[PDB]
Amino acid sequence: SRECSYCGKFFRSNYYLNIHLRTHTGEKPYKCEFCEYAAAQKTSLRYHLERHHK
Amino acid sequence: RECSYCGKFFRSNYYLNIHLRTHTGEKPYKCEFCEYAAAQKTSLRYHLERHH
DNA sequence: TTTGCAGAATCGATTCTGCA
DNA sequence: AATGCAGAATCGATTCTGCA
Ligand SMILES: [Cl-]
Ligand SMILES: [Zn+2]
Ligand SMILES: [Zn+2]
Ligand SMILES: [Zn+2]
Ligand SMILES: [Zn+2]
Ligand SMILES: [Zn+2]
Ligand SMILES: [Zn+2]
Ligand SMILES: [Zn+2]
Ligand SMILES: [Zn+2]
């Protein structure tokens, strides 16, 4: 589907809905190699690298 | 009135002392419903309003 | 159509400031 | 002057979206 069971928002793809769901479940598949930081979305990890590891 | 972490200036020593918590992470405001702790009162107040 | 990059927008959480 | 409450202003870690 494309509607969130938690917050009711509708998304443009099933693909992004499933990414969006992590925000409510806690699931965070992108692990920082350098610390114990994890992120739901690639961009959060990328920012985390640029700012805490430099 | 000057902070030694960030160099910023403030209007008073009272507020400088509160400002330092943002760096030191001393968080005297404490939620009696979750392990949430804050440096400034407004943060604890916001926290109570939407969580509890 | 489904997946993905990339970076701007968002808005929760915090800091700053007007006034007492 | 020093303290303090309250909300305006700001910030930034994440979400969302133009594009491919
Ligand atoms: Cl304390
Ligand atoms: Zn949702
Ligand atoms: Zn969208
Ligand atoms: Zn890291
Ligand atoms: Zn580090
Ligand atoms: Zn400072
Ligand atoms: Zn709490
Ligand atoms: Zn929360
Ligand atoms: Zn910003």
Coordinates of all heavy atoms in Angstrom, one line a residue, chain C:
Chain C
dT1 O5' 2.8 1.7 -13.2 C5' 3.4 0.4 -13.6 C4' 4.7 0.3 -12.8 O4' 6.0 0.6 -13.5 C3' 4.9 0.7 -11.4 O3' 5.4 -0.5 -10.6 C2' 6.0 1.7 -11.4 C1' 6.9 1.1 -12.6 N1 7.7 2.1 -13.3 C2 9.1 1.8 -13.4 O2 9.6 0.8 -12.9 N3 9.8 2.8 -14.1 C4 9.4 3.9 -14.7 O4 10.2 4.7 -15.2 C5 7.9 4.2 -14.5 C7 7.4 5.4 -15.1 C6 7.2 3.2 -13.9
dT2 P 5.0 -0.6 -9.1 OP1 4.3 -1.8 -8.9 OP2 4.5 0.7 -8.6 O5' 6.5 -0.8 -8.4 C5' 7.3 -1.9 -8.9 C4' 8.8 -1.4 -8.8 O4' 9.1 -0.3 -9.7 C3' 9.1 -0.9 -7.4 O3' 10.2 -1.8 -6.8 C2' 9.6 0.5 -7.6 C1' 10.1 0.5 -9.0 N1 10.1 1.8 -9.7 C2 11.3 2.2 -10.3 O2 12.3 1.5 -10.3 N3 11.3 3.4 -11.0 C4 10.2 4.3 -11.0 O4 10.3 5.4 -11.6 C5 9.0 3.8 -10.4 C7 7.8 4.7 -10.4 C6 9.0 2.7 -9.8
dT3 P 10.7 -1.6 -5.3 OP1 11.0 -3.0 -4.9 OP2 9.7 -0.8 -4.6 O5' 12.1 -0.9 -5.5 C5' 13.1 -1.4 -6.4 C4' 14.1 -0.3 -6.7 O4' 13.5 0.8 -7.4 C3' 14.8 0.3 -5.5 O3' 16.2 -0.1 -5.6 C2' 14.6 1.8 -5.7 C1' 14.3 1.9 -7.1 N1 13.4 3.1 -7.4 C2 13.9 4.2 -8.1 O2 15.0 4.2 -8.6 N3 13.0 5.2 -8.4 C4 11.6 5.2 -7.9 O4 10.9 6.2 -8.2 C5 11.2 4.1 -7.1 C7 9.8 4.1 -6.6 C6 12.1 3.1 -6.9
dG4 P 17.3 0.2 -4.4 OP1 18.4 -0.7 -4.6 OP2 16.5 0.2 -3.1 O5' 17.7 1.7 -4.7 C5' 18.6 2.0 -5.9 C4' 18.8 3.4 -6.0 O4' 17.5 4.1 -6.4 C3' 19.2 4.2 -4.7 O3' 20.6 4.5 -4.9 C2' 18.4 5.4 -4.7 C1' 17.7 5.4 -6.0 N9 16.3 6.0 -6.0 C8 15.2 5.5 -5.4 N7 14.1 6.3 -5.6 C5 14.6 7.3 -6.4 C6 14.0 8.5 -6.9 O6 12.8 8.8 -6.7 N1 14.8 9.3 -7.6 C2 16.2 9.1 -7.8 N2 16.8 10.0 -8.5 N3 16.8 8.0 -7.3 C4 16.0 7.2 -6.6
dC5 P 21.4 5.3 -3.8 OP1 22.8 4.7 -3.7 OP2 20.6 5.4 -2.5 O5' 21.6 6.7 -4.4 C5' 22.1 6.8 -5.7 C4' 22.0 8.3 -6.1 O4' 20.6 8.6 -6.2 C3' 22.7 9.2 -5.2 O3' 23.6 10.1 -5.9 C2' 21.5 10.0 -4.5 C1' 20.4 9.9 -5.5 N1 19.1 9.9 -5.0 C2 18.2 10.9 -5.5 O2 18.6 11.8 -6.2 N3 16.9 10.8 -5.0 C4 16.5 9.8 -4.2 N4 15.2 9.8 -3.8 C5 17.4 8.8 -3.8 C6 18.6 8.9 -4.2
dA6 P 24.7 10.9 -5.2 OP1 25.7 11.3 -6.3 OP2 25.1 10.3 -4.0 O5' 23.9 12.3 -4.9 C5' 23.4 13.1 -5.9 C4' 22.5 14.2 -5.3 O4' 21.3 13.6 -4.8 C3' 23.1 14.9 -4.1 O3' 23.2 16.3 -4.4 C2' 22.2 14.6 -2.9 C1' 20.9 14.2 -3.6 N9 20.0 13.2 -2.9 C8 20.4 12.1 -2.2 N7 19.4 11.4 -1.7 C5 18.3 12.2 -2.0 C6 16.9 12.0 -1.8 N6 16.4 11.0 -1.0 N1 16.1 12.9 -2.3 C2 16.6 13.9 -3.0 N3 17.8 14.2 -3.3 C4 18.7 13.3 -2.8
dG7 P 24.1 17.3 -3.6 OP1 25.0 17.9 -4.5 OP2 24.6 16.5 -2.4 O5' 23.0 18.3 -3.0 C5' 22.0 18.9 -3.8 C4' 20.8 19.2 -2.9 O4' 20.2 17.9 -2.5 C3' 21.1 20.0 -1.6 O3' 20.1 20.9 -1.4 C2' 21.0 18.9 -0.6 C1' 19.9 18.1 -1.1 N9 19.6 16.8 -0.5 C8 20.6 15.9 0.0 N7 20.0 14.9 0.5 C5 18.7 15.1 0.3 C6 17.6 14.2 0.7 O6 17.6 13.1 1.2 N1 16.3 14.8 0.3 C2 16.2 16.0 -0.3 N2 14.9 16.4 -0.5 N3 17.2 16.8 -0.6 C4 18.4 16.3 -0.3
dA8 P 20.4 22.4 -1.3 OP1 21.0 22.8 -2.6 OP2 21.0 22.7 0.0 O5' 18.9 23.0 -1.3 C5' 17.9 22.7 -2.3 C4' 16.6 22.5 -1.6 O4' 16.5 21.2 -0.9 C3' 16.2 23.6 -0.5 O3' 14.9 24.0 -0.8 C2' 16.4 22.8 0.8 C1' 16.1 21.4 0.4 N9 16.8 20.3 1.2 C8 18.2 20.3 1.4 N7 18.5 19.2 2.0 C5 17.3 18.5 2.3 C6 17.1 17.3 3.0 N6 18.0 16.6 3.5 N1 15.8 16.9 3.0 C2 14.8 17.7 2.5 N3 15.0 18.8 1.8 C4 16.3 19.2 1.7
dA9 P 14.0 24.9 0.3 OP1 13.1 25.8 -0.5 OP2 14.9 25.5 1.3 O5' 13.2 23.8 1.1 C5' 12.4 22.8 0.4 C4' 11.4 22.2 1.4 O4' 12.1 21.2 2.2 C3' 10.8 23.1 2.3 O3' 9.4 22.7 2.4 C2' 11.6 23.0 3.6 C1' 12.1 21.6 3.6 N9 13.5 21.4 4.1 C8 14.5 22.2 3.8 N7 15.7 21.7 4.3 C5 15.3 20.5 4.9 C6 16.1 19.5 5.6 N6 17.4 19.6 5.8 N1 15.4 18.5 6.0 C2 14.1 18.4 5.8 N3 13.3 19.2 5.2 C4 14.0 20.3 4.7
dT10 P 8.4 23.2 3.5 OP1 7.0 23.1 3.0 OP2 8.9 24.5 4.1 O5' 8.7 22.2 4.7 C5' 8.3 20.8 4.6 C4' 8.7 20.2 5.9 O4' 10.1 20.4 6.2 C3' 8.0 20.7 7.2 O3' 7.1 19.7 7.6 C2' 9.1 21.2 8.1 C1' 10.3 20.4 7.6 N1 11.6 21.0 7.7 C2 12.6 20.2 8.3 O2 12.4 19.1 8.8 N3 13.8 20.8 8.4 C4 14.2 22.1 7.9 O4 15.3 22.5 8.0 C5 13.1 22.8 7.2 C7 13.4 24.1 6.7 C6 11.9 22.2 7.2
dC11 P 6.0 20.0 8.8 OP1 5.0 18.9 8.7 OP2 5.7 21.4 8.7 O5' 6.9 19.9 10.1 C5' 7.3 18.6 10.6 C4' 8.0 18.8 11.9 O4' 9.2 19.6 11.7 C3' 7.1 19.7 12.9 O3' 7.3 19.4 14.2 C2' 7.6 21.1 12.7 C1' 9.1 20.8 12.5 N1 9.9 21.8 11.8 C2 11.3 21.7 11.8 O2 11.8 20.7 12.3 N3 12.1 22.7 11.2 C4 11.5 23.7 10.7 N4 12.3 24.7 10.2 C5 10.1 23.9 10.7 C6 9.3 23.0 11.3
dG12 P 6.3 18.5 15.1 OP1 5.8 17.5 14.2 OP2 5.4 19.5 15.7 O5' 7.2 17.8 16.1 C5' 8.1 16.8 15.7 C4' 9.4 16.8 16.4 O4' 10.2 18.0 16.0 C3' 9.2 17.0 18.0 O3' 10.3 16.2 18.5 C2' 9.4 18.5 18.2 C1' 10.4 18.9 17.1 N9 10.2 20.2 16.5 C8 9.0 20.9 16.2 N7 9.2 22.1 15.7 C5 10.6 22.1 15.5 C6 11.4 23.2 15.0 O6 11.1 24.3 14.5 N1 12.8 22.8 15.1 C2 13.3 21.7 15.6 N2 14.6 21.6 15.6 N3 12.5 20.7 16.1 C4 11.2 21.0 16.0
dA13 P 10.5 15.9 20.0 OP1 11.1 14.6 20.2 OP2 9.2 16.2 20.7 O5' 11.6 17.0 20.4 C5' 12.8 16.9 19.8 C4' 13.7 18.1 20.2 O4' 13.2 19.3 19.5 C3' 13.6 18.5 21.7 O3' 15.0 18.3 22.1 C2' 13.1 19.9 21.7 C1' 13.3 20.4 20.3 N9 12.4 21.4 19.8 C8 11.0 21.4 19.8 N7 10.5 22.5 19.3 C5 11.6 23.2 18.8 C6 11.7 24.4 18.1 N6 10.6 25.2 17.7 N1 12.9 24.9 17.8 C2 14.0 24.2 18.2 N3 14.0 23.0 18.8 C4 12.8 22.6 19.1
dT14 P 15.4 18.7 23.5 OP1 16.6 17.8 23.8 OP2 14.3 18.7 24.4 O5' 16.0 20.1 23.4 C5' 17.2 20.4 22.6 C4' 17.3 21.8 22.3 O4' 16.1 22.4 21.8 C3' 17.6 22.7 23.6 O3' 18.9 22.9 23.8 C2' 16.7 23.9 23.4 C1' 16.1 23.8 22.0 N1 14.7 24.3 21.9 C2 14.5 25.4 21.1 O2 15.4 26.0 20.6 N3 13.2 25.8 21.1 C4 12.1 25.2 21.7 O4 11.0 25.7 21.5 C5 12.4 24.1 22.5 C7 11.3 23.4 23.1 C6 13.7 23.6 22.5
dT15 P 19.5 24.0 24.8 OP1 20.9 23.7 25.2 OP2 18.4 24.2 25.9 O5' 19.4 25.4 24.0 C5' 20.1 25.6 22.8 C4' 19.9 27.0 22.2 O4' 18.5 27.2 22.0 C3' 20.4 28.1 23.1 O3' 21.0 29.2 22.4 C2' 19.1 28.5 23.8 C1' 18.1 28.4 22.7 N1 16.7 28.1 23.2 C2 15.7 28.9 22.6 O2 16.0 29.8 21.7 N3 14.5 28.7 23.0 C4 14.1 27.7 24.0 O4 12.9 27.6 24.3 C5 15.2 26.9 24.5 C7 14.9 25.9 25.6 C6 16.4 27.2 24.1
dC16 P 21.7 30.4 23.0 OP1 23.0 30.7 22.3 OP2 21.8 30.2 24.5 O5' 20.7 31.6 22.8 C5' 20.2 31.9 21.5 C4' 19.1 32.9 21.5 O4' 17.8 32.4 22.1 C3' 19.4 34.2 22.2 O3' 18.9 35.2 21.4 C2' 18.6 34.1 23.5 C1' 17.4 33.3 23.1 N1 16.7 32.5 24.1 C2 15.3 32.6 24.2 O2 14.7 33.4 23.6 N3 14.6 31.7 25.1 C4 15.3 30.8 25.8 N4 14.6 30.1 26.6 C5 16.7 30.7 25.7 C6 17.4 31.5 24.8
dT17 P 19.2 36.8 21.6 OP1 19.3 37.4 20.2 OP2 20.3 36.9 22.6 O5' 17.8 37.4 22.3 C5' 16.6 37.3 21.6 C4' 15.5 37.8 22.4 O4' 15.1 36.8 23.4 C3' 15.8 39.1 23.2 O3' 14.6 39.9 23.3 C2' 16.1 38.5 24.6 C1' 15.0 37.4 24.6 N1 15.2 36.4 25.7 C2 14.0 35.8 26.2 O2 12.9 36.1 25.8 N3 14.3 34.8 27.1 C4 15.5 34.3 27.5 O4 15.5 33.4 28.3 C5 16.6 35.0 26.9 C7 18.0 34.6 27.4 C6 16.4 36.0 26.0
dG18 P 14.6 41.4 22.8 OP1 14.7 41.4 21.3 OP2 15.7 42.1 23.6 O5' 13.2 41.9 23.3 C5' 12.0 41.2 22.8 C4' 10.9 41.2 23.9 O4' 11.2 40.1 24.8 C3' 10.9 42.5 24.8 O3' 9.5 42.7 25.1 C2' 11.6 42.1 26.0 C1' 11.2 40.6 26.2 N9 12.1 39.8 26.9 C8 13.5 39.7 26.8 N7 14.0 38.8 27.6 C5 12.9 38.3 28.3 C6 12.9 37.2 29.3 O6 13.8 36.6 29.8 N1 11.6 36.9 29.7 C2 10.5 37.6 29.2 N2 9.3 37.1 29.7 N3 10.5 38.5 28.3 C4 11.7 38.8 27.9
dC19 P 9.0 44.2 25.5 OP1 7.8 44.4 24.7 OP2 10.2 45.1 25.5 O5' 8.5 44.0 27.0 C5' 7.6 42.9 27.3 C4' 7.9 42.5 28.7 O4' 9.2 41.8 28.8 C3' 7.9 43.6 29.7 O3' 6.8 43.4 30.6 C2' 9.2 43.4 30.5 C1' 9.5 42.0 30.1 N1 10.9 41.5 30.3 C2 11.2 40.4 31.0 O2 10.3 39.8 31.6 N3 12.5 40.0 31.2 C4 13.5 40.7 30.6 N4 14.7 40.2 30.8 C5 13.2 41.8 29.8 C6 12.0 42.2 29.7
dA20 P 6.4 44.5 31.7 OP1 4.9 44.7 31.6 OP2 7.3 45.6 31.6 O5' 6.6 43.7 33.1 C5' 6.0 42.4 33.3 C4' 6.6 41.7 34.5 O4' 7.9 41.3 34.3 C3' 6.6 42.6 35.8 O3' 6.3 41.8 36.9 C2' 8.0 43.1 35.8 C1' 8.7 41.8 35.3 N9 10.1 42.0 34.8 C8 10.6 42.9 34.0 N7 11.9 42.8 33.7 C5 12.3 41.7 34.5 C6 13.5 41.1 34.7 N6 14.6 41.4 34.0 N1 13.5 40.0 35.5 C2 12.4 39.6 36.1 N3 11.2 40.1 36.0 C4 11.2 41.2 35.2

